[PDB]
């Protein structure tokens, strides 16, 4: 029935955003990517020279089809927020309409009404400091790209999807229990997007019928995974998912996939406002082995 | 050939039926566990046609229902059973519906299954407070209600395949005080939904086999209305205060079970699901 | 005149004695609720001057034990004693243990009280996993260690003053999976924090009477060590991991119980209150 | 033993603030008050004018005995955080020595080492405003006052506290379950708090032996409660409270004071890490009579 799914936050294969696409396409829902504004271009180039066509690979009987690649900066709601330093940089210089509003705006007129969208960025600065050794600065940073960004996103596109549509984003387990090493206010900015799914779920359930979930995924080797580091943080984390979690297997990309996949269907119709553990049930555990 | 066992269906008004319903969308074979006391109501009435229109998923399908058995979760084992048990008018005639015999039954008929659906409870004392509550009635809440579940696990577990997937249904009452679910209702579902986890990571590690709770919104059950129009309560708030106005439907929880029960939610395991159109997320009605 | 019943003391290795040394700081007269198998091993180590040391405070003061009676959870009345506990060679020489019995006898020794304190557990099968834990097993971790306080409270309100306060002791397998924690243990723990709530609001609104639990780390009781150096593990664990390094002692979950029951926490109820050196707020061991 | 207490967060004698010093007097704790610049000026008048003697009666056995009182302003850590602008203001200009890190210096060379620190306070610029309607920098603002201000609280304070020392903030349920009106981010901002208590718990135990917890209060008609309102918001929770929380008595101050009380002393030395509430119960209903 023309399913149409904005994907603001990929830059590459290797994250989340990528198994949210790969699953949805599966079930021929259309995809439009929102690229932030420093990787734009090197995706863009990889895509067309082909470097993603095996990661595009379905099951060998299909492959995805992305309808769209457009930029996106989550920092930005509208076009005047936008400081005249970033317009002017290097790699902002040749982008346009990559603000929150703008890009909403932009779907709007190619497809018309959508009806599922995907937060699955964020950004700190500090994230490699613990908490205490965190910036005002530093972590505003954190809440302002990891947390406020649904919000607005929530904000601009609700105008243009229809009753029934469903939003989810991404969060993790250390907003609820202590993670050493998930710093700079990360731990902070995800206890308030989870939070906010709660406060978003009432507001876009009684006032447009829409709803509001969000995925606690287990632990994945993305790009942003990698740069938690100090001085590896992700490696640790899943040798430690792999050894205690309830189920052993490797925890997929296409595995958080295909529960955003579900949470985006009409099948969970009667689920918003949740945090919805997709990590082998280790979050269950106290004591190890 | 996914096959699911669903234990817990009376009629076509409760939790069971809309899970039955959702997961014959999905061309899955459905085994009915059905109490013995309304066993051979159940079967009359179907044999009447009764449940024909509740039975019709479109214009393409209509429910297609493997076998129905009578199955008593109060019982692990034939020897379990009392004789004034045995001397009832409605279990004389039916034999092999304690847990193990079902799984024996099932097992020998159809192979070994793949779906477990555990959509049962019972409270003797469910009309009294929690604190005018008698042992006997909170031990048989808790035993009819949530350690069936440990042993419907046990059992079938034996007659199942790697990977498959066990799904039961809980009640916020549980987390939060719900004045009138009485007789230790709410303690059975406590430990009910904490049993989830600790038999996640038993069946986890051990079989690679997944349990997962969906803790329901009311639905104008038979089970509900024997509670004391405190359902009709439950329900009126709910859709006045619920972020999703939509009337909760048996399916809405059917089709969160059908995804809980299939491969697509492989990633997920010892989980509380809040399928109530999110009035759990709510503190004060607006 | 402040009176507290401490159901649940069989030595002072455990956390029924740190309750009791805490709260005779405060001056607050205590009585022993002592299980009968235990109840002349204790009498007999306390005339011996076995627990002289241990009763001491400081300088000042030694603990003022008001008395010292034998309880049994496990029974609501005189009627409900089974002939072969009767036959007992432990319970024969003893009487008026029974819930209802005790609050009868303190109420005609004593008077009204004011404080309850529910330290005390049992399951049978507590050394197995859940998953090969049997119906009566099962049901007698809950009869045991969640029921018994519904029942205490039940009986001992009649006997409590109008702002009396009630605690129990809990553990966080109710919520995160400890393996080994087994028999249903983690379930009547899970059913105990529910109840507390539950309990809560009835108690609160019909008699202003206040319930909280606490849900302790791991102390090298007698009970504990029943359990399978499991409890080796736990304290080793938590001595490593815990945000507090900090040896965790009976009187550090006494000091919390003493404010719990004092009217200084007047606006706490039905809370679960953790005193464990923060071990619960962890995710991944550092 | 010369407990010392540090309150950063009183203006009146209306709030929580005032009903925590007014139960650690009670208990012989010596008391300094954190006073924001806005209000410290009406502050001092007032108290120097008797205003707030019958307040500071204990049992008309005791009164009240306020150490020192100190202007402070939570938005700053340091001296050189603070914009030329509010250096210059006609409130500020006066003052010195407001910043955390300043507050924390003169306190230590005044008193030396203190052993309890208590953060009452939170503000948010649009509270008023439903979280969909909040803007980046209203939400942002939320944050940075109501939440990185404890953070940097301890930052600063670590340093002047002996071992054993002991750290409360106050939050509210908002951040759990939804309460419509509550709003700029003030939800976010508790999340972020219950969870940042939670990982400074870890470091603060560790590295110092110190401990930190929250405590979720009821509903109080402070000064800033009455703020909330638009176009009251603290009338309607204060009546909804007091018909169905399980305890029907009216919540007092000193209620959450004595709580405060405790959870600074060495009677909770084995709690930290932690959100307490202190709300005759309330949180634990789901469906009202
Ligand atoms: N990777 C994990 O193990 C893990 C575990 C739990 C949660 N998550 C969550 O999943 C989400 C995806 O992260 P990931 O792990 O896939 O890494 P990722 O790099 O694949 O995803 C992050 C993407 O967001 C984009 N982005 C960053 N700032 C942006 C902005 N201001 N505007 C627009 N786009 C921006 C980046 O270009 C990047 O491609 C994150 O929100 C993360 O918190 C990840
Ligand atoms: N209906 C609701 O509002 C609601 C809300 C939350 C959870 N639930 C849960 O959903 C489940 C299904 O109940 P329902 O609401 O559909 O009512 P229901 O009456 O349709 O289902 C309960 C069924 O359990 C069966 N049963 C009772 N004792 C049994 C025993 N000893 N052995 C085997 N079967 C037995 C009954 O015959 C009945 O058919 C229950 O576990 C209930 O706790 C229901
Ligand atoms: N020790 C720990 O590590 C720990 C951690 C969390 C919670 N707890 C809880 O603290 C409480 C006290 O146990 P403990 O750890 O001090 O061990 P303990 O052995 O000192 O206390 C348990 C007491 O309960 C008594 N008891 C057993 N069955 C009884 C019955 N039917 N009637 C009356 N009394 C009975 C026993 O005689 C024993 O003295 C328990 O409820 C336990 O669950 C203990
Ligand atoms: N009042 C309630 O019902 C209630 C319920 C739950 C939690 N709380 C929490 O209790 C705390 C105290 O608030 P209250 O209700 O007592 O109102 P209050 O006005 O008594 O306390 C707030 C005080 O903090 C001060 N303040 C504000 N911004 C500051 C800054 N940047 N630097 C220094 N001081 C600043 C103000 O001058 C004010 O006096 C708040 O954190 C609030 O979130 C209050
Ligand atoms: N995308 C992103 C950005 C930053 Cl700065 C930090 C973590 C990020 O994602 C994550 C990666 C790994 C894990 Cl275990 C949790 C995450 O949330
Ligand atoms: N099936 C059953 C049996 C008993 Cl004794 C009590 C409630 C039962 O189901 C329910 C019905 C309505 C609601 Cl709101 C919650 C339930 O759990
Ligand atoms: N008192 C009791 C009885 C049984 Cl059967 C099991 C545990 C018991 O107490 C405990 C001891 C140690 C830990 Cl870590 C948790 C407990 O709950
Ligand atoms: N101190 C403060 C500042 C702002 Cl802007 C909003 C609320 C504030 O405190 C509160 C008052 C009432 C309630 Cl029920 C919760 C609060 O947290």
């Avoid at 997007?193 to 509001?212: F, M």
Wanted: hydrophobic share 35%.
């Amino acid at each position: 029935n023309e399913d149409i799914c904005f994907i603001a936050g990929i830059g590459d294969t290797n994250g989340y955003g990528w198994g949210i696409a790969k699953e949805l396409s599966k079930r021929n829902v259309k995809i439009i990517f929102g690229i932030w504004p420093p990787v734009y271009n090197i995706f863009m180039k990889n895509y067309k020279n082909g470097k993603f066509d095996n990661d595009m690979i379905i099951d060998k009987d299909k492959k995805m089809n992305i309808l769209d690649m457009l930029p996106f900066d989550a920092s930005f709601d509208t076009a005047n927020d936008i400081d005249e330093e970033t317009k002017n940089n290097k790699r902002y210089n040749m982008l346009q309409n990559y603000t929150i509003e703008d890009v909403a705006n932009l779907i709007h007129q190619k497809y018309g009404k959508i009806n599922m969208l995907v937060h699955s960025l964020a950004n700190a600065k500090e994230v490699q400091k613990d908490l205490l050794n965190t910036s005002r600065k530093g972590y505003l940073d954190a809440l302002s790209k990891s947390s406020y960004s649904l919000i607005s996103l929530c904000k601009y596109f609700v105008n243009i999807m229809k009753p029934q549509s469903s939003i989810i984003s991404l969060t993790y387990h250390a907003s609820q229990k202590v993670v050493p090493g998930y710093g700079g206010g990360m731990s902070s900015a995800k206890a308030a997007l989870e939070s906010d799914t709660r406060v978003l779920a009432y507001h876009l359930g009684r006032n447009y019928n829409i709803r509001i979930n969000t995925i606690s995924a287990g632990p994945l080797k993305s790009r942003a995974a990698t740069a938690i580091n100090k001085l590896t943080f992700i490696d640790y984390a899943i040798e430690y998912s792999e050894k205690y979690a309830p189920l052993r297997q490797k925890l997929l990309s296409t595995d958080i996939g295909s529960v955003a996949s579900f949470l985006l269907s009409r099948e969970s119709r009667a689920i918003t406002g949740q945090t919805i553990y997709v990590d082998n049930g280790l979050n269950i555990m106290f004591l190890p082995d």
